[PDB]
């Protein structure tokens, strides 16, 4: 019923954790027309406007750097404070 | 118990660099700010640096801002003080202190026992010990003059501690950029010279230890 960015389980320690496959939109195959290679070097750019959006269950804004496209794993050494720090709580 | 025990120091020639450290025990170190203070030969107390409860801010006085740098590692509960471009005016005894919060100001609860820093250009010299007997009554005061050593301190023990009850140890006095002290002991005429009296002078800086039997003149 909806694309879901987070899945807390596995599909019927594992490498299938957080994998909601039913979120696939499909593939776009590009190629020069014709039996033979094109005569020119080409570059295609794909833009995407999202329309008619509906969202549910809001959640904490990622405050740590992303490491992988799949999971939310972060760097357990480089755990930085959400925002700019200061000297004392009495100085501005 | 709250314990601050510091390490490092000794003789350094002027211009050299050194690092001092203090080790904490029996209180949560991270929740406190920590400072060093120095005492010139038992008189003047001078603040030299503080560090915030975490990394945060460091604060320095205007005699030192530039050469010293105070640090902490809140895994082993230990302060650090590196001192670079050390000068002759930096000779003193350095304590590590804990800084607590009061109504408005701050206060230093516990002080460590200090390390001693001597910044100086001369050599390390073993001392010379000379007996002090007299050339007539019922009490005998003997002595032991130990002259021309560097640095401090030295130690004068009398018959290996047996005579400690009648012993005066007079502070070492600096002249010739060498130190010179005296030490006296008091003894009943029943003990001397019928029994050996001997002063024992140990100078750890050089690992030199000399013994003088006081023989009657």
CA gap A75, A61 in Å, rounded: 17
> Which residues of chain B lie closer than 8 angstroms to A88, CB-CB?
52, 56-57
Q: How many Å lie between the alpha carbon of B28 and the closest alpha carbon of chain A?
A: 20
Given the DSSP bridges, would you call strands B92-101 and B33-39 parallel, antiparallel or unpaired? antiparallel
Resolution (A): 6.8
**How many residues are given for chain A?**
92
Q: How many Å lie between the alpha carbon of B179 and the closest alpha carbon of chain A?
A: 47
Question: Using an 8 Å Cβ cutoff, are B151 and B179 in contact?
Answer: yes
**A26 is written with which tokens?**
């499909």
Count the Cβ atoms, other than its own, within 10 Å of residue B87: 11
CA gap B139, B192 in Å, rounded: 9
Chain B residue at shortest CA distance from A86 = B56
Question: Using an 8 Å Cβ cutoff, are A38 and A31 in contact?
Answer: no
Element (H, E) at B53: none
Taking each continuous run of H as one helix and of E as one strand, the counts in chain A are 0, 0
CA gap B176, A84 in Å, rounded: 58
Q: What is the DSSP letter of B31?
A: G
Question: Using an 8 Å Cβ cutoff, are B214 and B159 in contact?
Answer: no
Taking each continuous run of H as one helix and of E as one strand, the counts in chain B are 0, 18
> A with B: how many residue pairs have Cβ under 8 Å apart?
6
Q: Which of B82, B105, B76, B95 is closest to B35 using CA atoms?
A: B95
**How many residues are given for chain B?**
217
Residues 6+ apart with CB under 8 A from A51: none
Using a 10 angstrom Cβ sphere, with 0-12 exposed, 13-18 middle and 19 or more buried, the burial of residue A30 is exposed
- Scan residues 54-113 of B and list those with Cβ closer than 8 Å to A: 56-57
**Coil, helix or strand for B166?**
helix
Longest dimension (CA), chain A: 73
What is the layout of strands, in order, in the sheet containing B128-132? B128-132, B139-149, B179-188, B167-174
Given the DSSP bridges, would you call strands B115-119 and B10-12 parallel, antiparallel or unpaired? parallel
Q: Which of B201, B171, B199, B184 is closest to B140 using CA atoms?
A: B184
CA of residue B152 relative to chain centroid, distance: 8
**Coil, helix or strand for B173?**
strand
**B90 is written with which tokens?**
């930096």
**Coil, helix or strand for B123?**
coil
* Main-chain phi, psi angles of B62, to 5 degrees: -80, 0
Question: Using an 8 Å Cβ cutoff, are B150 and B105 in contact?
Answer: no
Q: How many Å lie between the alpha carbon of B55 and the closest alpha carbon of chain A?
A: 9
Chain B residue at shortest CA distance from A91 = B57
**A71 is written with which tokens?**
């999971």
């Amino acid at each position: 019923s909806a694309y879901q960015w987070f899945y807390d389980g596995y599909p019927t320690k594992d490498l299938e954790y957080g994998a909601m496959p039913n979120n696939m939109m499909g593939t776009f195959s590009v190629r020069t027309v014709g039996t033979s290679k094109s005569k020119y070097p080409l570059v295609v750019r794909i833009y995407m406007r999202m329309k008619h959006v509906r969202a549910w269950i809001p959640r904490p804004m990622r405050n740590q750097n992303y490491l992988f496209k799949a999971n939310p794993n972060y760097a357990g050494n480089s755990i930085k404070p959400t925002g700019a720090s200061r000297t004392a709580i009495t100085t501005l | 118990e709250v314990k601050l025990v510091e390490s490092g120091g000794g003789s350094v020639k002027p211009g050299g660099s050194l690092k001092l450290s203090c080790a904490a025990s029996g209180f949560s170190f991270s929740t406190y700010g920590m400072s060093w203070v120095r005492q010139t030969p038992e008189k003047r107390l001078e603040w030299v640096a503080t560090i915030s409860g975490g990394g945060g801010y460091t604060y320095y006085p205007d005699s030192v801002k530039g050469r010293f740098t105070i640090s902490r590692d809140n895994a082993r509960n230990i302060l650090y003080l590196q001192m670079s471009s050390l000068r002759s005016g930096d000779t003193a005894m350095y304590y590590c202190a804990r800084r607590v919060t009061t109504v408005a100001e701050y206060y230093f609860d516990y002080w460590g026992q200090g390390t001693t820093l001597t910044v100086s250009s001369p050599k390390t010299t073993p001392p010379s010990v000379y007996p002090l007997a007299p050339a007539t009554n019922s009490m005998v005061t003997l002595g032991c003059l130990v002259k021309g050593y560097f640095p401090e301190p030295v130690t004068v023990t009398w018959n290996s501690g047996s005579l400690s009850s009648g012993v005066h140890t007079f502070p070492a006095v600096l002249q010739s950029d060498l130190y010179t002290l005296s030490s006296s002991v008091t003894v009943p005429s029943s003990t001397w010279p019928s029994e050996t009296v001997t002063c024992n002078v140990a100078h750890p800086a050089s690992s030199t230890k000399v013994d003088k039997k006081i023989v009657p003149r």
